Amino acid sequence: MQTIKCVVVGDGAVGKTCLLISYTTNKFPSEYVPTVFDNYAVTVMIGGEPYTLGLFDTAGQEDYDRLRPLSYPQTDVFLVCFSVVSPSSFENVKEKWVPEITHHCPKTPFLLVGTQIDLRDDPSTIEKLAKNKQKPITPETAEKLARDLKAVKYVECSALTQKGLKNVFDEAILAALEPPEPKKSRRS
């Protein structure tokens, strides 16, 4: 049975773990957000055939540049995450994450994933960012970065409301089924 290894990378606190929990349990952790997400196997049906979507979290490894890459080998698709209400996590996408997974896995496609979109339109959040002259990242901005970094595409979601959550992973499946081609420039 073919397996699609999907590894989720990105700064700590962008909700990598959170996003995985919500997709696999189809419900958001109300009173306690688990810290741990062990390697998980989701059976998915691709054109009548069964496949294993192997999900991998990287939470807690963000600071160790030598331990972190030990997860990269055999990856079929990367989800590069940044929170749409954290400009720094966004900055780290082009500055740290894409360069790294690109180096280790040249032929491996990756998606740009904006998270916590449910906060994007929240006074307190808008407000907090203002205190540092910052604003939430817009879909347009993110889409531009995705085109520039050669991400297969840009998708965004909310682990809390689950908006676009399912779609993030469908796109990851689609990206993983494409013939092993090197990062090609994107339209749109």
């Binding site: 810290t35 390697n39 807690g60 030598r66 030990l70």
Partner: protein, 337 residues
Amino acid sequence: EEEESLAILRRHVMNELLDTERAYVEELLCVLEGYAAEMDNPLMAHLISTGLQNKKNILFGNMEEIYHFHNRIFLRELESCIDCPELVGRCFLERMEEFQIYEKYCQNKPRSESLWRQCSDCPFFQECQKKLDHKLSLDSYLLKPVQRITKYQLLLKEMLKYSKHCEGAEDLQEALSSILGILKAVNDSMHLIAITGYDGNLGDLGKLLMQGSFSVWTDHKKGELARFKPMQRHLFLHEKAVLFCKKREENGEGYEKAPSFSYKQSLNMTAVGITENVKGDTKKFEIWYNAREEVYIIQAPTPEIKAAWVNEIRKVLTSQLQACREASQHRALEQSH
């Protein structure tokens, strides 16, 4: 009441710590018996050469030792904290040395990977997997230890968050720092073994205190240079010297993606000096040599990294002085005719 909300949350963290600990232990055993053991099962000897069978220890590193520690010692002790989760920090402090075993495992992981790349197709594995009814490959299980050691600091930080006014908050904080300590040392050491071209024993340099990548400038006394455009170097701060290496960026066949370093030169600590502040950049500092006949302007990626380097260098310069002094007194205590 507040005190009550925090006790609940503390229990949540304790439960997760315990559940994931069991799963971990159980998942290690499951693979040590489901794969590692099968490499000795004659009934399977027809699916595995002797060459592979002899490389079991390269594939699994010290997973068994690690399994032993958690199965016999740790899980037991964590469970002795159910009624008082705040005291779990003491479990960690009481066993800090044992966690050193993760250093060996992580250092050997890339080696195991390289091997796995070649034999992952071997029928032996597809067979063991089927018998185990695993949807994920052995490789994913071999990653577990790496993932587990890097979860403990998250769990501790989470427990400390809901334990500020508890008896044991200090121990929690100490456990958190010690674990962060080990993770740093492990990660630091992975860079050290990637150094190439060092004619000599690296262990003679003493403990590796820090390592990192920096933009370096030279400003040596008139009489490789980086006068205006910085050069890139990876520095290793050891007790007896600072090493300058260059990130080799050549893969070749098999493509060893983890960067390796080429040794360039050493600055003996006994002649090393330091300048804490450089005009125009809070993250720059200087490591000079021989009263400045050699001056390197280092730009750290952040002001915090710069501060950490400076403090570490200063501790080394301070110990060097104390040591040098205790030496002269044992020499001067020769005033006995």
